[PDB]
Amino acid sequence: GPKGDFPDVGDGRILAG
16 A cells, blocks of 8 residues: 555555455
């Protein structure tokens, strides 16, 4: 995810369904 707390592909993700 981009703008989030879960680093994925930027800053972080919000959903991970």
